[PDB]
From Swiss-Prot:
This is Matrix protein p10. It is found in: Virion. It comes from Simian retrovirus SRV-1. A lipid is attached at residue 2 (N-myristoyl glycine). It comes from the Viruses. The chain holds residues 2 to 100 of 658 of the full protein. Matrix protein.
Length: 100
């Protein structure tokens, strides 16, 4: 909140467009809030051969369930649906590696 413009914000914007072409309809702020959500309760970002984003949303989906019931909608469940589109996006990439 201290800095209006940040590298993290730009990163999301890229995902917004890229994922959008995959059939994802989410707001820029929505993704930004999610990124801050994990960073707030989870300052780590472990990576593995399998869908790395899985662990990211995994924490959100869990705490999101309780937060959703409590009231904090900061991270709407709709994230899971859009996530389905990502699963296919990353999975396809894991096939036929390409270099630019």
């Amino acid at each position: 909140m201290g800095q209006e413009l940040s590298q993290h914000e730009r990163y999301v914007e890229q995902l917004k467009q890229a994922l959008k072409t995959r059939g994802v309809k989410v707001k820029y702020a929505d993704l930004l809030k999610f990124f801050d959500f994990v960073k707030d309760t989870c300052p780590w970002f472990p990576q593995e051969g399998t869908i790395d984003i899985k662990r990211w949303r995994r924490v959100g989906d869990c705490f999101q369930d309780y937060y959703n019931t409590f009231g904090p909608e900061k991270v709407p469940v709709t994230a899971f649906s859009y996530w389905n589109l990502i699963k296919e996006l990353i999975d396809k990439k894991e096939v036929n590696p390409q270099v630019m």
